[PDB]
Structure formats: C-alpha cells, structure tokens
C-alpha cells in the first residue's frame, strides 16, 4: 500500500472482516496526523490535542504500531516536545507520557540512527516532580502515579 507498516497486530489479519480493516487503518491514521498537527499549530491543546492523542493511543491498541518509520519518529518527536514543555500541567503531561512510552516501548523498531532524543529536558521534569520544593508546602498538588 502507501506505507510499509511497522509492528501491525497479527490477530487483525485473522479476523473475518480483515479485508475492510486496511482501509479504516489508513483513514484513521490520516485524520490523526492532520488533526493532531493542526491542533498543536493552532495551540488548542485541551479541546483537540488531547482528543487526538487519545485517538492515536486507541489506534495502537486496535491496529498495533501500523505506521511508517518516518511517521513513528515524527509522532515520537512531537510527543517528546509536548512532554518537555516547561510549565505544562502535570496531569496533561501524564497523558502525553503514556502515549510516548507506548511508541518507544518496542526498541527493535527504531535503530538509534532513526531517533536521537535529548536528555536535559527530561532531567528538568524529574527535578520538578521527584524533588519539588513547592510540594512539601502543599503549593504543587501533583498526581499520585
Ligand atoms: O500475544 P499477546 O497475548 O497479544 O501479547 C502480546 C505479547 O505479550 P506476551 O507475548 O509477552 O504475552 C507481546 O510481547 P512479545 O511479543 O514481546 O513477547 C507484547 O508485549 P511487550 O510489549 O511486553 O512485548 C504485546 O503487548 P502490548 O499490547 O503492550 O504491545 C502483547 O500483549 P497484549 O496482550 O497487551 O497485546
């Protein structure tokens, strides 16, 4: 087809209506790429960005990674920038983090040459949450997990 799929779920192929599944996967991914990109550029993180981030997590659950290496790296880069925003709501970061962990969970797919994420932004986040001066005074109110 248009792209070479990465890590698609095998059970989808065995399903009785499998032939129809390929068309749905292409359309849903196409909408996710356009809408997630549009939301971040338009700066609408809560109404649209979160909704489309959730749709991609559902896409991975339903269809497996099922995307090109270029798409996989682009999603991972976008999520890392969203996860490392300095003043981001910690609840909002938790949703972004779960999608980013799922994308990077299988390290066979990416070859190190494909992805070169930085470490200093992640360090700023761990200092902010793991060792927060404000939380002891009750100013921060961080999430449980
Ligand atoms: O074959 P399933 O029962 O659907 O389980 C698989 C399998 O897990 P196990 O084979 O270990 O049960 C994968 O693991 P491997 O192919 O690496 O052996 C993988 O799990 P990993 O990510 O730990 O590899 C994946 O999990 P996910 O859904 O997170 O992709 C998935 O488990 P699910 O039942 O959750 O699909």
Curated annotation (Swiss-Prot):
Signal sequence coordinates: none
Location in the cell: Cytoplasm, Cytosol; Nucleus; Nucleus speckle
Record comment regarding domains: The bromodomain-like (BRDL) region specifically recognizes and binds acetylated histones.
Function: Associated component of the proteasome that specifically recognizes acetylated histones and promotes ATP- and ubiquitin-independent degradation of core histones during spermatogenesis and DNA damage response. Recognizes and binds acetylated histones via its bromodomain-like (BRDL) region and activates the proteasome by opening the gated channel for substrate entry. Binds to the core proteasome via its C-terminus, which occupies the same binding sites as the proteasomal ATPases, opening the closed structure of the proteasome via an active gating mechanism.
Protein family (similarity comment): Belongs to the BLM10 family.
Subunit structure, as described in the record: Homodimer. Interacts with the 20S and 26S proteasomes. Component of the spermatoproteasome, a form of the proteasome specifically found in testis.
Protein name (database record): Proteasome activator complex subunit 4
Taxonomic lineage of the native organism: Eukaryota, Metazoa, Chordata, Craniata, Vertebrata
